[PDB]
Amino acid sequence: SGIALSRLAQERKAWRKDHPFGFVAVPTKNPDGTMNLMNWECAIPGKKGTPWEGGLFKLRMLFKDDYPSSPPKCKFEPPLFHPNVYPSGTVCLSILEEDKDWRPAITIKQILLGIQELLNEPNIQDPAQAEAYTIYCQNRVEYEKRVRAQAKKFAPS
């Protein structure tokens, strides 16, 4: 698609004007000083009212030129404790897979929003990591205890 760079351009433009409170999406810099629109540094706030509240979670978004026929890859930096996050930090979510739920009209905005949603609504049937699945299934109170300590750890300022 010729439209990847041009669309990322407009997405960034739009974001600066109108975006969800608490969130950060910043394209990184090519060494010649231009923005690299295939690589963005993002931050997702834990949801208020949830054990995720208070933390701010860094996430990198990698695109390719087939965007948006294909979704970007999204990695938590550093890797997060969560049933649907890989050890690599890769977020595993149906709207990020080219065929299940991914559609070209889905925007970065919705992606971040969606990844935010996945924090407190994990899918335990198909975990992406052993560590978090184990605890969640074993003692759910201990699981939340870990999630809270992770929020504190990634609390900003």
Partner 1 sequence: DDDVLIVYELTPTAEQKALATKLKLPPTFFCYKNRPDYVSEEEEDDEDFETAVKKLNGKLYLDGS
Partner 2 sequence: ADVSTFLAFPSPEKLLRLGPKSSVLIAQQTDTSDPEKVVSAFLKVSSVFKDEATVRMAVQDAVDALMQKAFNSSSFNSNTFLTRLLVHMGLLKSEDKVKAIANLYGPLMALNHMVQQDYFPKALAPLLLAFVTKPNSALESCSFARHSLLQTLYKV
Partner 3 sequence: DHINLKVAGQDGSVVQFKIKRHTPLSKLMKAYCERQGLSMRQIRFRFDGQPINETDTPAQLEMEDEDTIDVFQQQTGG
- Report the interface residues with partner 2, using CB under 8 A: 86-88, 90, 92, 126-131, 133-134, 137-138
**Interface mask (CB under 8 A) for partner 3, residues 58-97, using x and -?**
-------------------------xx-------xxxx-x
Residues 24-52: b if buried by 16+ CB within 10 A, e if exposed: bbebeeeeeeebebbebebbbbbeeebbb
> What are 60's strand-pairing partners?
41, 75
How far apart, in whole angstroms, are the C-alpha atoms of residue 101 and residue 117?
15
Let me know if 74 is a catalytic residue. Answer: no
Q: Does 113 bind partner 1 (CB under 8 A)?
A: no
- Which residues lie closer than 8 Å to 143 by C-beta, 6 or more apart? 132, 135, 136
101 contact choice in partner 3, partner 1, partner 2, none (CB below 5 to 8 Å, kind-dependent) = partner 3
Footprint of partner 3 (CB under 8 A): 83-84, 92-95, 97, 101, 105-107, 110, 113-114, 117-118, 121-123, 126, 128
